[PDB]
Every structure is written in C-alpha cells, then in structure tokens.
Amino acid sequence: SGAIYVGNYRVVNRHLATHNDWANLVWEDSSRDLLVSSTTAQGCDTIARCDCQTGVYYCSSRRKHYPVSFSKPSLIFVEASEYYPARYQSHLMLAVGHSEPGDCGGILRCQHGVVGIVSTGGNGLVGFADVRDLLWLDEE
Ligand SMILES: Cn1nc(C(=O)NC[C@@H]2Cc3ccccc3CN2)c2ccccc21
Ligand SMILES: [Zn+2]
C-alpha cells in the first residue's frame, strides 16, 4: 500500500484504488496502474522533474529503504504473477531488488523529489510506475 500526496491530489496504484478514489476521480490508466483522485487537504510531497536513474525506494516487506539504479520509463511485459495475468504496463521503470505485492505504493525518490511508486515485480526485479511526466500534478 501507499500513495503520493501533492497539492489536492492523491496518486495511488489503480489496482488498489478505493471506492472514495473512483468517486472523486481525476485520471486513471490501466496501461500504467495509476489513478489520481482529489483531496480536501493539501499534500506535502514534491514530484521530481528530471531524468535521474538512481534513487531510493521503500520496501514494506523488509521495513527498509534501498538505494537502486533504475531504467528510464518504458513498455514492459509483466509475466503472469500468482494473482495478476501477464500484461504490458507502460511508463514503467525497472531495478534489481526485493518486492512483494503489498509493497505496491512504496515511493521511489531521487534528489529532486518523488519519482514513482512500486507497481510490479518478480524474478528479483522491482518495477515503478513513473509520475515525473505528469506536469499537471504541480498546478491547478
Ligand atoms: C511489487 N509487485 N507488484 C506486483 C503486482 O502483481 N502488482 C499488481 C499490478 C496491477 C496489475 C494488474 C494486471 C496485470 C498486471 C498487474 C501488475 N501490477 C507483484 C507481484 C509479484 C511480486 C512483486 C510484485
Ligand atoms: Zn531526479
């Protein structure tokens, strides 16, 4: 679990969005596992605007933050998991490291702020849904 709180937006994994999320929807993409809903409260997170490929991600299944190198956002085959069919997620970044399902929503961060959220994993890789191209998270 986990979310990004920027301005009056809440960014979550689309597969973990609540009814309150869907009832207050701004934007959703199955192609990215991202959903953004509206909040009453102002959030304190800053979105990175950059092309960093090093950062740190939170791994709930180890109660640890890990430093990683990651690929630039791309179109990636997510091999079938026990609970999710094979599908192609887009705007996806991969790193070598530990992940399990309940780590989806963990933040990846660089020197510039929040880069993305854990979205995929398997065979010793962890996949992050990028948010750095969503410039509108910064305004309105
Ligand atoms: C961190 N992590 N995440 C997942 C995961 O399945 N997330 C669901 C999410 C939504 C979804 C829906 C349809 C098709 C594919 C997908 C893929 N991404 C996972 C599985 C094994 C190990 C680690 C993992
Ligand atoms: Zn950066």
Tab-separated table of N, CA, C and O in Angstrom, residues 9-108:
chain	number	residue	atom	x	y	z
A	9	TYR	N	-4.136	16.448	-4.792
A	9	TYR	CA	-4.167	15.145	-5.495
A	9	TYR	C	-3.619	14.035	-4.600
A	9	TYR	O	-2.686	14.190	-3.773
A	10	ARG	N	-4.192	12.847	-4.829
A	10	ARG	CA	-3.784	11.571	-4.215
A	10	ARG	C	-3.490	10.597	-5.357
A	10	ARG	O	-4.376	10.371	-6.205
A	11	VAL	N	-2.223	10.166	-5.473
A	11	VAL	CA	-1.796	9.260	-6.571
A	11	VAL	C	-1.629	7.882	-5.953
A	11	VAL	O	-0.783	7.725	-5.054
A	12	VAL	N	-2.386	6.919	-6.465
A	12	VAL	CA	-2.341	5.527	-5.962
A	12	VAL	C	-2.165	4.569	-7.129
A	12	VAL	O	-2.413	4.954	-8.289
A	13	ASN	N	-1.805	3.322	-6.807
A	13	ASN	CA	-1.887	2.232	-7.798
A	13	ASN	C	-3.363	2.043	-8.204
A	13	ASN	O	-4.244	1.917	-7.292
A	14	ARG	N	-3.637	2.035	-9.478
A	14	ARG	CA	-5.028	1.858	-9.991
A	14	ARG	C	-5.640	0.570	-9.409
A	14	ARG	O	-6.815	0.623	-8.902
A	15	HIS	N	-4.850	-0.491	-9.276
A	15	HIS	CA	-5.384	-1.789	-8.759
A	15	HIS	C	-5.710	-1.727	-7.268
A	15	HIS	O	-6.427	-2.644	-6.787
A	16	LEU	N	-5.264	-0.710	-6.530
A	16	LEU	CA	-5.518	-0.558	-5.083
A	16	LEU	C	-6.438	0.630	-4.790
A	16	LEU	O	-6.683	0.888	-3.595
A	17	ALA	N	-6.960	1.303	-5.818
A	17	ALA	CA	-7.849	2.475	-5.626
A	17	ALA	C	-9.118	2.045	-4.890
A	17	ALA	O	-9.634	0.914	-5.149
A	18	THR	N	-9.569	2.892	-4.009
A	18	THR	CA	-10.801	2.688	-3.209
A	18	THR	C	-12.042	3.176	-3.957
A	18	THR	O	-11.966	3.926	-4.954
A	19	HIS	N	-13.235	2.877	-3.417
A	19	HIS	CA	-14.468	3.489	-3.965
A	19	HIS	C	-14.371	5.009	-3.807
A	19	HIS	O	-14.753	5.696	-4.746
A	20	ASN	N	-13.889	5.530	-2.671
A	20	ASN	CA	-13.774	7.000	-2.498
A	20	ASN	C	-12.861	7.576	-3.603
A	20	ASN	O	-13.168	8.645	-4.188
A	21	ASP	N	-11.799	6.849	-3.946
A	21	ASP	CA	-10.934	7.285	-5.072
A	21	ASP	C	-11.733	7.432	-6.376
A	21	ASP	O	-11.604	8.440	-7.112
A	22	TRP	N	-12.452	6.381	-6.780
A	22	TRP	CA	-13.229	6.343	-8.030
A	22	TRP	C	-14.337	7.402	-8.010
A	22	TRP	O	-14.655	7.924	-9.042
A	23	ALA	N	-14.891	7.692	-6.830
A	23	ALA	CA	-15.987	8.648	-6.660
A	23	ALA	C	-15.477	10.099	-6.707
A	23	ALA	O	-16.308	11.041	-6.801
A	24	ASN	N	-14.144	10.293	-6.704
A	24	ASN	CA	-13.501	11.633	-6.670
A	24	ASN	C	-12.402	11.609	-7.741
A	24	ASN	O	-11.292	12.153	-7.518
A	25	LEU	N	-12.649	10.914	-8.843
A	25	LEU	CA	-11.598	10.603	-9.845
A	25	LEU	C	-11.151	11.863	-10.582
A	25	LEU	O	-12.006	12.691	-11.022
A	26	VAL	N	-9.859	11.918	-10.922
A	26	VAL	CA	-9.289	12.888	-11.903
A	26	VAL	C	-8.845	12.167	-13.182
A	26	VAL	O	-9.153	12.649	-14.297
A	27	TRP	N	-8.096	11.074	-13.041
A	27	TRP	CA	-7.480	10.379	-14.203
A	27	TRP	C	-7.097	8.964	-13.772
A	27	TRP	O	-6.766	8.791	-12.598
A	28	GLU	N	-7.174	7.997	-14.685
A	28	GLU	CA	-6.819	6.581	-14.414
A	28	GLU	C	-6.307	5.970	-15.717
A	28	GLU	O	-6.773	6.391	-16.805
A	29	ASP	N	-5.335	5.063	-15.615
A	29	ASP	CA	-4.711	4.384	-16.785
A	29	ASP	C	-4.367	2.957	-16.341
A	29	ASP	O	-3.540	2.799	-15.420
A	30	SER	N	-5.051	1.958	-16.907
A	30	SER	CA	-4.745	0.519	-16.718
A	30	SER	C	-3.347	0.253	-17.290
A	30	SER	O	-2.591	-0.497	-16.656
A	31	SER	N	-3.003	0.963	-18.368
A	31	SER	CA	-1.705	0.859	-19.088
A	31	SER	C	-0.550	1.234	-18.152
A	31	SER	O	0.577	0.945	-18.550
A	32	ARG	N	-0.813	1.806	-16.957
A	32	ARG	CA	0.251	2.337	-16.047
A	32	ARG	C	0.036	1.926	-14.581
A	32	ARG	O	0.901	2.250	-13.753
A	33	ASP	N	-1.094	1.298	-14.249
A	33	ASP	CA	-1.510	1.059	-12.847
A	33	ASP	C	-1.514	2.426	-12.126
A	33	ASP	O	-1.093	2.404	-10.955
A	34	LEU	N	-1.978	3.556	-12.734
A	34	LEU	CA	-2.050	4.820	-11.931
A	34	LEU	C	-3.509	5.289	-11.862
A	34	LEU	O	-4.262	5.208	-12.885
A	35	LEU	N	-3.879	5.764	-10.683
A	35	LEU	CA	-5.139	6.525	-10.515
A	35	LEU	C	-4.863	7.739	-9.624
A	35	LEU	O	-4.112	7.621	-8.658
A	36	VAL	N	-5.438	8.864	-10.002
A	36	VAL	CA	-5.352	10.133	-9.228
A	36	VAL	C	-6.760	10.573	-8.842
A	36	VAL	O	-7.622	10.675	-9.725
A	37	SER	N	-6.962	10.790	-7.564
A	37	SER	CA	-8.227	11.328	-7.005
A	37	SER	C	-7.948	12.711	-6.371
A	37	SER	O	-6.785	13.043	-6.077
A	38	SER	N	-9.014	13.430	-6.054
A	38	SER	CA	-8.979	14.782	-5.435
A	38	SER	C	-9.041	14.671	-3.919
A	38	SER	O	-9.702	13.768	-3.419
A	39	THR	N	-8.340	15.555	-3.190
A	39	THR	CA	-8.307	15.571	-1.708
A	39	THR	C	-8.810	16.931	-1.198
A	39	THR	O	-8.706	17.914	-1.905
A	40	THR	N	-9.397	16.959	-0.008
A	40	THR	CA	-9.775	18.226	0.668
A	40	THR	C	-8.483	18.905	1.146
A	40	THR	O	-8.281	20.106	0.824
A	41	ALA	N	-7.606	18.136	1.798
A	41	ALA	CA	-6.333	18.590	2.408
A	41	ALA	C	-5.244	18.797	1.344
A	41	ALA	O	-5.277	18.144	0.285
A	42	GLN	N	-4.288	19.681	1.633
A	42	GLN	CA	-3.096	19.905	0.772
A	42	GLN	C	-2.039	18.875	1.166
A	42	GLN	O	-1.836	18.687	2.372
A	43	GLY	N	-1.381	18.260	0.180
A	43	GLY	CA	-0.334	17.250	0.412
A	43	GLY	C	1.027	17.905	0.536
A	43	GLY	O	1.158	19.037	0.070
A	44	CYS	N	2.023	17.231	1.092
A	44	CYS	CA	3.349	17.854	1.345
A	44	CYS	C	4.396	17.294	0.361
A	44	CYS	O	5.504	17.860	0.307
A	45	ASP	N	4.053	16.300	-0.472
A	45	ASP	CA	5.071	15.731	-1.417
A	45	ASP	C	5.347	16.638	-2.620
A	45	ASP	O	4.425	17.311	-3.116
A	46	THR	N	6.588	16.564	-3.120
A	46	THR	CA	7.117	17.241	-4.325
A	46	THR	C	7.441	16.177	-5.370
A	46	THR	O	8.049	15.128	-5.002
A	47	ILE	N	7.002	16.419	-6.598
A	47	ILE	CA	7.266	15.499	-7.727
A	47	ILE	C	8.586	15.913	-8.375
A	47	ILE	O	8.787	17.117	-8.626
A	48	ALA	N	9.496	14.965	-8.537
A	48	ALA	CA	10.756	15.180	-9.286
A	48	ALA	C	10.421	15.555	-10.743
A	48	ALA	O	9.527	14.949	-11.371
A	49	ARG	N	11.201	16.500	-11.301
A	49	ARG	CA	11.149	16.865	-12.733
A	49	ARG	C	12.563	16.743	-13.287
A	49	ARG	O	13.373	17.674	-13.127
A	50	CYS	N	12.855	15.588	-13.859
A	50	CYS	CA	14.260	15.150	-14.091
A	50	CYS	C	14.336	13.832	-14.833
A	50	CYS	O	13.294	13.214	-15.048
A	51	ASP	N	15.549	13.420	-15.247
A	51	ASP	CA	15.803	12.085	-15.848
A	51	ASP	C	16.812	11.294	-15.001
A	51	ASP	O	17.573	10.539	-15.593
A	52	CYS	N	16.788	11.448	-13.677
A	52	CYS	CA	17.552	10.545	-12.759
A	52	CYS	C	17.235	9.068	-13.043
A	52	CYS	O	16.071	8.672	-13.307
A	53	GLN	N	18.298	8.279	-12.892
A	53	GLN	CA	18.235	6.812	-12.920
A	53	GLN	C	18.865	6.255	-11.627
A	53	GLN	O	19.099	5.057	-11.622
A	54	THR	N	19.044	7.041	-10.567
A	54	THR	CA	19.401	6.492	-9.216
A	54	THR	C	18.471	7.133	-8.192
A	54	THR	O	18.073	8.288	-8.353
A	55	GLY	N	18.126	6.392	-7.189
A	55	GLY	CA	17.239	6.834	-6.116
A	55	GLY	C	17.142	5.798	-5.049
A	55	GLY	O	18.047	4.963	-4.883
A	56	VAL	N	16.119	5.935	-4.221
A	56	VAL	CA	15.898	5.090	-3.027
A	56	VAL	C	14.419	4.708	-3.011
A	56	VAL	O	13.601	5.582	-3.203
A	57	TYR	N	14.055	3.436	-2.816
A	57	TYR	CA	12.634	3.001	-2.699
A	57	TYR	C	12.338	2.326	-1.359
A	57	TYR	O	13.245	1.799	-0.740
A	58	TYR	N	11.104	2.502	-0.885
A	58	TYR	CA	10.627	1.879	0.358
A	58	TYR	C	10.050	0.509	0.026
A	58	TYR	O	9.136	0.395	-0.820
A	59	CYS	N	10.538	-0.498	0.753
A	59	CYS	CA	10.128	-1.922	0.631
A	59	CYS	C	9.419	-2.348	1.921
A	59	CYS	O	10.133	-2.663	2.916
A	60	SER	N	8.089	-2.350	1.897
A	60	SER	CA	7.282	-2.611	3.119
A	60	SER	C	7.562	-4.038	3.618
A	60	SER	O	7.492	-4.237	4.873
A	61	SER	N	7.855	-4.967	2.716
A	61	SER	CA	8.035	-6.423	3.013
A	61	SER	C	9.414	-6.652	3.685
A	61	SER	O	9.693	-7.794	4.104
A	62	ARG	N	10.224	-5.592	3.837
A	62	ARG	CA	11.510	-5.629	4.591
A	62	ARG	C	11.594	-4.484	5.614
A	62	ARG	O	12.603	-4.396	6.327
A	63	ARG	N	10.568	-3.626	5.727
A	63	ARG	CA	10.628	-2.388	6.543
A	63	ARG	C	11.944	-1.649	6.278
A	63	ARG	O	12.579	-1.152	7.229
A	64	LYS	N	12.345	-1.546	5.004
A	64	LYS	CA	13.660	-0.946	4.652
A	64	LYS	C	13.516	-0.062	3.401
A	64	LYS	O	12.722	-0.427	2.488
A	65	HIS	N	14.325	1.005	3.357
A	65	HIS	CA	14.556	1.788	2.135
A	65	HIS	C	15.841	1.253	1.540
A	65	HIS	O	16.858	1.131	2.274
A	66	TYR	N	15.850	1.068	0.231
A	66	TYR	CA	17.019	0.552	-0.515
A	66	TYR	C	17.428	1.524	-1.602
A	66	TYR	O	16.608	1.932	-2.439
A	67	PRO	N	18.746	1.780	-1.751
A	67	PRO	CA	19.248	2.558	-2.880
A	67	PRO	C	19.338	1.700	-4.138
A	67	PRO	O	19.742	0.546	-4.024
A	68	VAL	N	18.809	2.233	-5.271
A	68	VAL	CA	18.760	1.478	-6.553
A	68	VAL	C	19.142	2.333	-7.743
A	68	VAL	O	18.933	3.556	-7.752
A	69	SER	N	19.682	1.672	-8.754
A	69	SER	CA	19.683	2.165	-10.151
A	69	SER	C	18.455	1.633	-10.887
A	69	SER	O	18.070	0.461	-10.665
A	70	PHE	N	17.798	2.442	-11.746
A	70	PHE	CA	16.574	2.029	-12.453
A	70	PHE	C	16.598	2.470	-13.918
A	70	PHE	O	17.268	3.468	-14.228
A	71	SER	N	15.894	1.716	-14.756
A	71	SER	CA	15.777	2.047	-16.198
A	71	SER	C	14.853	3.258	-16.400
A	71	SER	O	14.017	3.598	-15.538
A	72	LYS	N	14.978	3.923	-17.546
A	72	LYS	CA	14.060	5.042	-17.917
A	72	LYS	C	12.680	4.462	-18.204
A	72	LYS	O	12.538	3.299	-18.536
A	73	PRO	N	11.592	5.244	-17.961
A	73	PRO	CA	10.224	4.761	-18.146
A	73	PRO	C	10.042	4.227	-19.572
A	73	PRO	O	10.420	4.934	-20.511
A	74	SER	N	9.416	3.027	-19.665
A	74	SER	CA	9.285	2.119	-20.861
A	74	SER	C	8.058	1.173	-20.850
A	74	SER	O	7.306	1.105	-19.837
A	75	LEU	N	7.834	0.441	-21.965
A	75	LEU	CA	6.756	-0.581	-22.125
A	75	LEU	C	7.322	-1.976	-21.824
A	75	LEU	O	8.185	-2.445	-22.591
A	76	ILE	N	6.768	-2.641	-20.817
A	76	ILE	CA	7.378	-3.836	-20.167
A	76	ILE	C	6.336	-4.934	-20.031
A	76	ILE	O	5.249	-4.658	-19.497
A	77	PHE	N	6.697	-6.147	-20.448
A	77	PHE	CA	5.890	-7.351	-20.183
A	77	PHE	C	6.057	-7.728	-18.711
A	77	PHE	O	7.189	-7.995	-18.236
A	78	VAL	N	4.942	-7.693	-17.993
A	78	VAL	CA	4.832	-8.200	-16.600
A	78	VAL	C	4.356	-9.654	-16.641
A	78	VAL	O	3.124	-9.921	-16.743
A	79	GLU	N	5.313	-10.576	-16.581
A	79	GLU	CA	4.997	-12.020	-16.545
A	79	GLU	C	3.831	-12.187	-15.581
A	79	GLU	O	3.801	-11.480	-14.517
A	80	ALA	N	2.891	-13.059	-15.948
A	80	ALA	CA	1.853	-13.540	-15.022
A	80	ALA	C	2.494	-13.648	-13.643
A	80	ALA	O	3.681	-14.057	-13.555
A	81	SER	N	1.765	-13.207	-12.625
A	81	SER	CA	2.029	-13.468	-11.191
A	81	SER	C	0.947	-14.426	-10.697
A	81	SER	O	0.028	-14.780	-11.491
A	82	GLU	N	1.056	-14.868	-9.450
A	82	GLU	CA	0.038	-15.748	-8.845
A	82	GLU	C	-1.348	-15.104	-8.971
A	82	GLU	O	-2.308	-15.858	-9.165
A	83	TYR	N	-1.461	-13.772	-8.881
A	83	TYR	CA	-2.770	-13.071	-8.750
A	83	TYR	C	-3.049	-12.128	-9.928
A	83	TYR	O	-4.196	-11.664	-10.058
A	84	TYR	N	-2.068	-11.862	-10.777
A	84	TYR	CA	-2.229	-10.918	-11.904
A	84	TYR	C	-1.797	-11.620	-13.190
A	84	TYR	O	-0.710	-12.200	-13.268
A	85	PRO	N	-2.641	-11.572	-14.244
A	85	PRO	CA	-2.269	-12.125	-15.533
A	85	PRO	C	-1.064	-11.355	-16.063
A	85	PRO	O	-0.770	-10.221	-15.614
A	86	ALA	N	-0.369	-12.002	-16.984
A	86	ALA	CA	0.529	-11.347	-17.941
A	86	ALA	C	-0.182	-10.104	-18.481
A	86	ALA	O	-1.381	-10.199	-18.868
A	87	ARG	N	0.485	-8.958	-18.428
A	87	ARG	CA	0.066	-7.752	-19.180
A	87	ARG	C	1.276	-6.862	-19.417
A	87	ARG	O	2.267	-7.019	-18.666
A	88	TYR	N	1.172	-5.977	-20.411
A	88	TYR	CA	2.131	-4.890	-20.733
A	88	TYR	C	1.776	-3.578	-20.028
A	88	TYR	O	0.886	-2.835	-20.537
A	89	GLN	N	2.475	-3.265	-18.930
A	89	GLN	CA	2.374	-1.933	-18.273
A	89	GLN	C	3.330	-0.972	-18.999
A	89	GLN	O	4.402	-1.479	-19.406
A	90	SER	N	2.982	0.323	-19.139
A	90	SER	CA	3.754	1.413	-19.826
A	90	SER	C	4.346	2.460	-18.835
A	90	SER	O	3.869	2.398	-17.664
A	91	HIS	N	5.229	3.422	-19.236
A	91	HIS	CA	5.818	4.376	-18.253
A	91	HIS	C	6.378	3.598	-17.029
A	91	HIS	O	6.250	4.086	-15.871
A	92	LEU	N	6.902	2.418	-17.266
A	92	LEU	CA	7.430	1.548	-16.185
A	92	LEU	C	8.964	1.591	-16.139
A	92	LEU	O	9.609	1.539	-17.190
A	93	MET	N	9.503	1.678	-14.929
A	93	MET	CA	10.974	1.704	-14.643
A	93	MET	C	11.327	0.444	-13.875
A	93	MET	O	10.603	0.093	-12.913
A	94	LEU	N	12.402	-0.252	-14.245
A	94	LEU	CA	12.813	-1.491	-13.511
A	94	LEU	C	14.141	-1.283	-12.752
A	94	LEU	O	15.032	-0.558	-13.233
A	95	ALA	N	14.272	-1.942	-11.605
A	95	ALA	CA	15.516	-2.032	-10.806
A	95	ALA	C	15.690	-3.463	-10.311
A	95	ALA	O	14.718	-4.211	-10.233
A	96	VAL	N	16.911	-3.797	-9.919
A	96	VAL	CA	17.218	-5.089	-9.252
A	96	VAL	C	16.937	-4.846	-7.791
A	96	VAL	O	17.570	-3.959	-7.162
A	97	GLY	N	16.012	-5.608	-7.237
A	97	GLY	CA	15.825	-5.571	-5.787
A	97	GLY	C	14.637	-6.371	-5.344
A	97	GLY	O	14.034	-7.078	-6.147
A	98	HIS	N	14.336	-6.277	-4.054
A	98	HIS	CA	13.284	-7.104	-3.438
A	98	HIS	C	11.926	-6.395	-3.503
A	98	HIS	O	11.844	-5.197	-3.156
A	99	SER	N	10.885	-7.128	-3.887
A	99	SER	CA	9.480	-6.653	-3.797
A	99	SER	C	8.528	-7.842	-3.698
A	99	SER	O	8.871	-8.944	-4.172
A	100	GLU	N	7.388	-7.592	-3.062
A	100	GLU	CA	6.225	-8.494	-2.925
A	100	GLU	C	4.994	-7.612	-3.114
A	100	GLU	O	5.105	-6.380	-3.063
A	101	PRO	N	3.799	-8.198	-3.348
A	101	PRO	CA	2.635	-7.398	-3.733
A	101	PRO	C	2.274	-6.197	-2.847
A	101	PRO	O	2.001	-5.119	-3.407
A	102	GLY	N	2.242	-6.395	-1.522
A	102	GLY	CA	1.886	-5.339	-0.554
A	102	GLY	C	2.931	-4.241	-0.440
A	102	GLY	O	2.703	-3.313	0.350
A	103	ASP	N	4.033	-4.315	-1.204
A	103	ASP	CA	4.931	-3.158	-1.454
A	103	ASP	C	4.425	-2.242	-2.583
A	103	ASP	O	5.001	-1.148	-2.699
A	104	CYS	N	3.446	-2.609	-3.414
A	104	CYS	CA	2.884	-1.633	-4.395
A	104	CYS	C	2.406	-0.392	-3.595
A	104	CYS	O	1.655	-0.586	-2.610
A	105	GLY	N	2.796	0.835	-4.017
A	105	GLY	CA	2.539	2.126	-3.380
A	105	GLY	C	3.753	2.673	-2.671
A	105	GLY	O	3.740	3.851	-2.294
A	106	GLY	N	4.792	1.862	-2.405
A	106	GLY	CA	6.039	2.389	-1.832
A	106	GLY	C	6.652	3.471	-2.732
A	106	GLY	O	6.703	3.259	-3.962
A	107	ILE	N	7.155	4.556	-2.180
A	107	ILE	CA	7.764	5.647	-3.002
A	107	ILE	C	9.184	5.288	-3.427
A	107	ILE	O	10.027	4.854	-2.577
A	108	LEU	N	9.463	5.619	-4.676
A	108	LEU	CA	10.827	5.801	-5.228
A	108	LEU	C	11.104	7.308	-5.277
A	108	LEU	O	10.256	8.017	-5.871
